[PDB]
Write a protein that binds this DNA or RNA. Structure first.
Length: 342
DNA sequence: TCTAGGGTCCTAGGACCC
DNA sequence: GGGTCCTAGGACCC
């Protein structure tokens, strides 16, 4: 058989919502991210900023060297959720097979759909419109017979465009496709693959699944499959959040437990408020804490626990702080909850 | 340039159980 | 010796 998978990807989503809601930002370089004195990184940038080299996940200090006139914005996450929910409702008009990946992204399985003569190509275009019409935002799409190829294709004609890969086109597409474009093949894995001569899927096809199972475990089976267009993963639509996390990185590092405890005191009510939205009685499976040090090493401590409790989180942080800070500065502290299994 | 905050899934050693 | 929990860490995603 053969499925029809759309990947929809809004363009510069947070920035596109800021330019819609304040046209004064349209053609000057803007970006959502913390200030440099807040030691932030960029979340998303508009195209005027990207012309300078401004990218997502870039430290804000670098973003600012590349683009000295960059306007920084702290983000209005209710204004990004209203559009995300709106957009997901537009998806529902065409199919209930919606696997959201983030506020700005979602997979759709439109095989069994019947809205544009089963043309996945025209369903996406109609979805890419509509969104434009009702939200004044643009989106790009990818159409393919499997998830990962649909996601790659959604990058091909960005912004405000789409790209279709048919099963006929798949082996051609795959032959020079760099491995790093595969979701789940990030910096580390790609550098390891490059150091064996493996750069593209074409190179992996010339490999043996047995030896790949040795060098990467069940990741090597994933590499093998993806390099041949194999992606059996189904658009899920039933996925539920499993954890809640609240952490902050301070403008200056902290070196005294009194400072750490003061941070937790501001963090705890925020975690309670967000947990209570999805669990009014605050009953959980595990809770825990996170410290990130001056040199960037990270440690987490968490344990089964039945119900959110501030004092046990302070307690846990005290133990981690004494037992593993070793004199270093601390740049972030976080609280964490693991939700009950349901 | 100096490195976020939401999250996901995988691995692996001991504990615990058979 | 074979089977799940617990926990910490890490790569990766947006």
């Amino acid at each position: 058989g053969s499925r029809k998978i759309i990947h929809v990807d809004m363009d510069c989503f947070f920035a596109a919502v800021e330019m819609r809601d304040n046209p004064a930002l349209r053609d000057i370089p803007i970006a959502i991210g913390g200030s440099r004195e807040r030691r932030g990184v960029i979340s998303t940038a508009n195209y005027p900023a990207r012309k300078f080299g401004v990218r997502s996940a870039m430290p804000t200090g670098m973003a600012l060297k590349l683009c000295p006139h960059l306007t920084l914005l702290p983000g209005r996450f209710d204004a990004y959720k209203e559009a995300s929910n709106h957009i997901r409702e537009i998806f529902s008009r065409y199919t209930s097979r919606i696997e959201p990946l983030s506020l700005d992204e979602a997979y759709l399985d439109v095989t069994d759909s019947v809205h544009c003569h089963g043309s996945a190509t025209l369903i996406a275009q109609e979805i890419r419109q509509t969104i434009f019409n009702e939200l004044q935002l643009t989106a790009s799409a990818g159409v393919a017979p499997v998830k990962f190829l649909a996601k790659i294709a959604s990058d091909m004609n960005k912004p405000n465009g789409q790209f279709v890969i048919t099963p006929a086109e798949v082996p051609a597409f795959l032959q020079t496709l760099p491995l790093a474009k595969i979701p789940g093949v990030g910096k580390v894995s790609a550098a390891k693959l490059e150091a064996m001569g493996l750069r593209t899927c074409g190179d992996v096809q010339k490999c043996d699944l047995v030896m790949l199972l040795k060098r990467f475990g069940k990741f090597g089976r994933i590499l093998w499959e993806r390099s041949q267009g194999i992606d059996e993963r189904d658009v899920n639509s039933e996925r539920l959040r499993k954890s809640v996390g609240v952490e902050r990185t301070m403008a200056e590092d902290i070196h005294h437990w009194s400072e750490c405890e003061a941070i937790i005191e501001r963090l705890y009510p925020e975690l309670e408020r967000r947990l209570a939205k999805v669990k009014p009685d605050l009953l959980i499976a595990r809770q825990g804490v996170k410290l990130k040090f001056d040199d960037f090493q990270q440690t987490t401590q968490e344990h089964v626990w039945p119900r959110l409790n501030k004092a046990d989180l302070i307690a846990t942080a005290r133990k981690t702080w004494d037992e593993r800070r070793g004199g270093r500065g601390v740049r972030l502290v976080g609280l964490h909850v693991t939700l009950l299994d349901p």
